[PDB]
Nucleic acid binder design. Structure first.
Lengths: 220, 218
DNA sequence: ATTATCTATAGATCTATAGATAATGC
DNA sequence: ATTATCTATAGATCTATAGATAATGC
C-alpha cells in the first residue's frame, strides 16, 4: 500500500505521483480557462483531493502555473537555438524551425501553447519568460530577414507557426505523437506557408532533411 | 463644455458616462483580461466609486459582453456583405482580409485581444460565440472556393487575426479610418493570405477594395 | 421629481495555514 | 515516527444591493 492517510476519492488523473496528477489537472484547466479564473478548488476537485491537500505539493497556485509554463517555453526556446545554427540556407533553416515548433506544439497532451499567450504572463512577475519568448521571436524574424530583407513580412512566419495553437485539440489526446520517421501534415503546411508568404521556393528534400536536424539536435 | 478640458478632469473618453466605462474597460480587459480586472479598478479609471457602475450596467459580465458585441457585429456585417458581392473568390477574400485588418486597426484599444480571451465559455456567451464562428466560416468558405478541400483553408483567418500582435494598445489609434487608404499592414496580411493559398494577386486589389467599402458604407 | 452618484455593507468567493488523523515504515 | 491526506477556518477581497444624498428640472 501507499504511505499517508488515504484520500477521500480515488485518483482521477494520469500521473506516477501527485505532482504529475496536479500538473495534469492544472494544464487542462489553465489552457481552457486561463489562470485567474481557475480556482484551487476546481484543481483539487479535478485531481480528486481536498483543496488544502494541494499545498503539501506546491506552495502556491502561481507555482503550479510557473511549472507548466517552464515545461513548454524551455524546450521550444532551446530547440530554436540548437537548430538556428546549422549547415543549410535560411530558407531551409526557417522551414525546419517552423516544422519543429509545430511538431512540438502538437506533441503535448494538452494545448500548452495557449499558456504563453495568456494575460497573467504580461505582468512583470513573469519576466524570465517574456525574455525567452522574445528571444525565440527574434530568431524567426532574423531568419526571415535573411530571405526578404528589412520588410514587415519578416514578422509573419512566427505568427503562422503559433497558429497551430488555434487549430489543435485540447482534450488530453495527443494529436500527433513524436516520430523520428515523419513530420505531422500540419507542420508541413505551416512551414510551406511560412515560405510562401516570404515568396521563396521550398527547399530541397525538406522533410527528409528536417528529420536529420532533429536527430542531430536530439543527440546534442 | 466650451474650451479645452482640464488635465485633472476624468481621463476617460466618450459622449456620455456609460461610454466612459467601456473606454476604461477596454483598456483593462485587453491588458489584464476579464477576471483579473476588478470593478473597483474600472471605477477608479472612470474616476468614480465602485458601486456606481451598477446604475449603468447590471454586471461586470454585461460590460464585457457589450464590448464584445460592439466589435464583432461591425465585422460580421462587413464580411457578410463583401462575401456575396460580384467579384472573384481571390478578390473577395483579399477585400475581407484587408478590411477586417483595417477595422481591427481602427479602434482605440486593441479589442481583438478580447477574442483570444478564454472567458467566453458561459451559456450566455453563446450569442457572441456562434457569431464568432459564423465570421470564421465566411473565411474558411472563401478560402475553400480558391483551393478546394485543403487544410490551408484555415490559414487566411489566422493570418488576418495576427494583426492583434502587431498593433499598439496604449490609447493612440494605430491607423485611423480613411476612404482613400488601406494601412500597410492590411495590405501585407491580405497579400499573405492569398500567397499561402497559391492564388494570383488581383492587379488593382487595393483600389477595388476601397471602392467596395464606399459602396458598402452607403 | 428626476437624476446620478455616494457611503455602507452582506455574502460569496478564494488562498493559504494550523492542527488532527490514518495509512505505512521501523 | 514518517508521510500524505483530511477538517476547519482566518483573513482578503470582490460583486452587487440598499438606502442616503447632492445636484438639477419643473
Amino acid at each position: 500500500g501507499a504511505v499517508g492517510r488515504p484520500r477521500r476519492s480515488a485518483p482521477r488523473r494520469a500521473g506516477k505521483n501527485p505532482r504529475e496528477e496536479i500538473l495534469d489537472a492544472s494544464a487542462e484547466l489553465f489552457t481552457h480557462q486561463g489562470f485567474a479564473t481557475t480556482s484551487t478548488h476546481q484543481i483539487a476537485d479535478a485531481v480528486g483531493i481536498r483543496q488544502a491537500s494541494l499545498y503539501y505539493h506546491f506552495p502556491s497556485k502561481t507555482e503550479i502555473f510557473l511549472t507548466l509554463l517552464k515545461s513548454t517555453v524551455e524546450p521550444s526556446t532551446v530547440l530554436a537555438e540548437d537548430l538556428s545554427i546549422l549547415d543549410a540556407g535560411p530558407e531551409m533553416r526557417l522551414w525546419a524551425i517552423v516544422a519543429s515548433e509545430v511538431r512540438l506544439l502538437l506533441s503535448t497532451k494538452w494545448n500548452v501553447g495557449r499558456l504563453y499567450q495568456l494575460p497573467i504572463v504580461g505582468s512583470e512577475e513573469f519576466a524570465e519568460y517574456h525574455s525567452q519568448r522574445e528571444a525565440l521571436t527574434n530568431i524567426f524574424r532574423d531568419l526571415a530577414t535573411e530571405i526578404v530583407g528589412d520588410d514587415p513580412r519578416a514578422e509573419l512566419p512566427f505568427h503562422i507557426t503559433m497558429s497551430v495553437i488555434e487549430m489543435r485539440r485540447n482534450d488530453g489526446k495527443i494529436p500527433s505523437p513524436l516520430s523520428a520517421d515523419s513530420l505531422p501534415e500540419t507542420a508541413i503546411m505551416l512551414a510551406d506557408a511560412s515560405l510562401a508568404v516570404l515568396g521563396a521556393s521550398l527547399p530541397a528534400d525538406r522533410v527528409e532533411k528536417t528529420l536529420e536536424l532533429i536527430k542531430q539536435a536530439d543527440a546534442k
